[PDB]
Amino acid sequence: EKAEIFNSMHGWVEDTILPFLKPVEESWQPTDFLPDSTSDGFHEQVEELRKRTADLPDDYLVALVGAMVTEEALPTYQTMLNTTDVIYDESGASPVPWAVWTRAWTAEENRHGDIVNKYLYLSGRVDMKQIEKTIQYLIGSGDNNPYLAYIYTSYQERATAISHGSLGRLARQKGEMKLAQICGTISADEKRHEAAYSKIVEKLFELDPEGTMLALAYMMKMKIVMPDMFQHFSAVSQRLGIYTAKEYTDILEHMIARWGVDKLTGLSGEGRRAQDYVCGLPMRFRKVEERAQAWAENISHVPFSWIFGRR
Amino acid sequence: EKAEIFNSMHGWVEDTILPFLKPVEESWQPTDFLPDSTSDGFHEQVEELRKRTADLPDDYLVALVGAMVTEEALPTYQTMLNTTDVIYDESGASPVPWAVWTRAWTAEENRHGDIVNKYLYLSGRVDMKQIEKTIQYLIGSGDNNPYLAYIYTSYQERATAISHGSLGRLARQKGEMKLAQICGTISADEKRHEAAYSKIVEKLFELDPEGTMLALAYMMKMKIVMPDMFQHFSAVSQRLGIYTAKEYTDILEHMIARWGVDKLTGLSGEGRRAQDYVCGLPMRFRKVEERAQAWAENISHVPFSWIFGRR
Ligand SMILES: [Fe+3]
Ligand SMILES: [Fe+3]
Ligand SMILES: [Fe+3]
Ligand SMILES: [Fe+3]
């Protein structure tokens, strides 16, 4: 039945989801936000960047490294959403619209880690050797239910749109307008992605409320949890205001509203147990917001000095 | 039966394939082969690179762009080999050794496109904006039989080990010792990868000669073919001697020998038709080697001037 639900969605994925892609022709590329290496001005542009970035506080460097590590892990996030599927009909073989979306979306995502990685490299502010190791360990690390991937990615796209957006805003506040542009441009990609993925989940709730509710309850319980090295990234994002416990709870309420999870009808006893669990979470998580803030305020970079580069 | 063949191989994959991984601790990283951005010497090192790279012929620039485009497409090559599999036993849940290999191998591969991409960027010799577009189109483009991926990757790892190795050798010949090191270091990764993948195919031939032969015949016929923009990369690799029609044929003979495809026994009529087809290919491809060379010698960069950066 899940396979068939997915199959029956092809037309709507084509009509409603694929338009959320931005044409490659109209798309920014990392080179847009970097010193021009073909230009006689290259060295001077690189120097300006390094000057601009010497003004950035340490917390900010760390959050930005957090964001790049997350993005650079792209090969291990698109893998769940990869569907070994291809449709046969009178026009011949073609790719399922699900795969057309995943592939093009992966191509979008690929630019996010590259821009931040080359920008941080050029700044000199972080030790790119240690961070590349981290990333190799992380790709090396990398339940089969096919709704789960879609739900998780909805949440992740909204969280990452908000985090990159807030990083951008703080870069702007410090006068680092190129870094603000980078962070803001990524955020705008993520806002589109979040829109496509939320709509997919919406549609799954429409067509299979029982399956989707059980999957969402599983995801909230098991996978998607309130927002040592990753703990440290998390603490820094908390105290900077980029991505907080309050924002996590706010994302949960938005998703509950957007998908009308507290308004589902016709559920079994099992479905209602799952709906009750999910819908009761925001009240549970409000209570731990003020503790998240205190904990973040005590974090030291001393165990993490290895992240930093030139001062 | 293919699923079961794969399942029955877990112990041997663990004992024989996983040791071909290089520990992340002992591993090079892109930063190793790049100007040190944390150093007061950064600008000077970047200048040395740009000087070293001004000595590189155009054919060489193009082949190197070919290689990076190929590598940077990594998200669309690991996807077939991704297996949504996880083993349950008395120790709990664990990852199938197939997935442990794929993940760690993907983490290895991720460094290949990054090093070449940042090196080419810093050189100024190519227009990275146009090449990033190309790459986005290419990831966006990106039969389900599970032997096919393993066979294809065997061939691809041997081809890419030979191509990066020969690019390295030519960089060396021009005195560009850092670029030679990069190309040579990648080649050595690919030689390990090729060894792991050839051994997998070997084992598939041992355990299921009939299935593997039919898959190999399919791959030679359909997918793996004698070595406009990709045609142009191919022509340049031909005339430079980096990767030629003769080398393609040589890879086919090596694989036939390594896996003893001309020595399989107990095949059905169908199996023997497939074995005869494959084993007759090298004689067929020798005949078109001298034509590949002539064709490559007539290629113009004029339609491809968009690749180039500063002169
Ligand atoms: Fe992203
Ligand atoms: Fe995204
Ligand atoms: Fe490679
Ligand atoms: Fe490889």
Question: Residue A160 class from Cβ within 10 Å (0-12 exposed, 13-18 middle, 19+ buried)?
Answer: buried
Q: Which amino acid is at B71?
A: E
Q: Are A263 and A273 in contact (CB under 8 A)?
A: no
CA distance A114 to B120: 14
- Residue A126 has φ and ψ, to the nearest 5°, of -140, 155
DSSP B217-246: HHIIIII-----HHHHHHHHHHHHTSS-HH
Q: Tell whether A189 is within 8 A of chain B (Cβ).
A: no
Interface test with B, best of A45, A49, A82 (most B CBs within 10 A): A82
Whether residues A79 and B80 touch (CB distance < 8 A) is answered with: no
Q: Which amino acid is at B85?
A: D
> Parallel, antiparallel, or unpaired for β B92-95 and A92-95?
unpaired
CA distance B198 to B205: 11
Residue numbers of B annotated as active site = 28, 71, 109, 112, 157, 160, 189-190, 193
Spell out the residues 6+ positions from residue A225 whose beta carbon is closer than 8 angstroms to its own.
Answer: none
Q: How many CB atoms lie within 10 A of CB B241?
A: 13
Q: Give the Å distance between the CA of A164 and the centre of ligand 1.
A: 9
Q: At what angle do helices B128-141 and A97-123 cross, to 10 degrees?
A: 150
3-state secondary structure chain A: CHHHHHHHCHHHHHHHHHHHCCCCCCCCCHHHHCCCCCCCCHHHHHHHHHHHHHCCCHHHHHHHHHHHHHHHCCHHHHHHHCCCCEEEECCEEEECHHHHHHHHHHHHHHHHHHHHHHHHHHHCCECHHHHHHHHHHHHHHCCCCHHHHHHHHHHHHHHHHHHHHHHHHHHHHCCCHHHHHHHHHHHHHHHHHHHHHHHHHHHHHHHCHHHHHHHHHHHHHHHCCCCCHHHHHHHHHHHHCCCCHHHHHHHHHHHHHHCCHHHCCCCCHHHHHHHHHHHCHHHHHHCCHHHHHHHHHCCCCHHHHHHECCC
Q: Tell whether B73 is within 8 A of chain A (Cβ).
A: no
CA distance A112 to A138: 17
Q: How many CB atoms lie within 10 A of CB A159?
A: 19
CA distance A100 to A97: 5
Nearest CB neighbour to A132, from listed B29, B78, B138: B29
Domain boundaries, chain A: 1-311
CA distance B101 to B135: 26
CA distance B30 to A1: 46
CA distance A136 to A140: 6
CA distance B179 to B199: 30
Whether residues A39 and B108 touch (CB distance < 8 A) is answered with: no
Question: Which residue(s) pair with A308 in the sheet?
Answer: A126
Q: Are B166 and B190 in contact (CB under 8 A)?
A: no
Question: Which residue(s) pair with B308 in the sheet?
Answer: B126
Q: How far is CA B1 from the centre of its chain?
A: 29
CA distance B215 to B152: 10
Q: Give the C-alpha distances (Å, rounded to integers) separating A297 from A230, A236, B267.
A: 16, 8, 70
CA angle A48, A51, A55 (to 5 degrees): 140
Report the residue of chain A nearest B23, measured CA to CA: A137
Q: Give the C-alpha distances (Å, rounded to integers) separating B135 from A220, B132, B196.
A: 36, 5, 28
Q: How many CB atoms lie within 10 A of CB B297?
A: 10
Residue tagged active-site, from A53, A70, A160, A244 = A160
Whether residues B37 and A123 touch (CB distance < 8 A) is answered with: yes
Provide the resolution (angstroms). Answer: 2.0
3-state secondary structure B114-157: HHHHHHHHHHCCECHHHHHHHHHHHHHHCCCCHHHHHHHHHHHH
Q: Give the C-alpha distances (Å, rounded to integers) separating B51 from B44, B124, B176.
A: 10, 10, 10
Q: Which amino acid is at A126?
A: V
Q: Which amino acid is at A89?
A: D
3 state SS of B288: coil
CA distance B155 to B224: 8
How many residue contacts between A and B have a Cβ separation below 8 Å? 150
CA distance A139 to A136: 5
CA distance A227 to A242: 11
CA distance A183 to B5: 47
Residue B232 assigned as binding residue: no
User: Rounded to a whole number, what is the distance in angstroms from the first to the last CA of chain B?
Assistant: 58
Spell out the residues 6+ positions from residue A8 whose beta carbon is closer than 8 angstroms to its own.
Answer: A207
Question: Which residue(s) pair with A168 in the sheet?
Answer: none
Spell out the residues 6+ positions from residue A291 whose beta carbon is closer than 8 angstroms to its own.
Answer: none
Q: Are B135 and B72 in contact (CB under 8 A)?
A: yes
Q: Are B310 and B124 in contact (CB under 8 A)?
A: yes
Q: Which amino acid is at A95?
A: P
Q: Are A56 and B116 in contact (CB under 8 A)?
A: no
Q: Give the Å distance between the CA of A17 and the centre of ligand 4.
A: 34
Q: Are A93 and A99 in contact (CB under 8 A)?
A: no
Nearest CB neighbour to B124, from listed A24, A42, A132: A42
Q: Give the Å distance between the CA of A187 and the centre of ligand 1.
A: 8
CA distance B304 to B308: 8
Interface test with B, best of A31, A86, A87, A133 (most B CBs within 10 A): A31
Annotated binding site of A for Fe cation: 71, 109, 112, 157, 190, 193
CA distance A152 to A162: 16
Q: Which ligand is closest in space to the CA of residue B70?
A: 3
Whether residues B79 and A76 touch (CB distance < 8 A) is answered with: no
Tokens representing A101 are: 């979306």
Whether residues B79 and A79 touch (CB distance < 8 A) is answered with: yes
Experimentally, the structure was elucidated by X-ray
Q: Tell whether B298 is within 8 A of chain A (Cβ).
A: no
CA distance B245 to A183: 46
Closest CA to B13 of B194, B211, B204: B204
CA distance B150 to B29: 26
- Residue A224 has φ and ψ, to the nearest 5°, of -85, 100
Interface test with A, best of B128, B305, B306, B311 (most A CBs within 10 A): B128
Question: Which residue(s) pair with A276 in the sheet?
Answer: none
- Residue B233 has φ and ψ, to the nearest 5°, of -55, -45
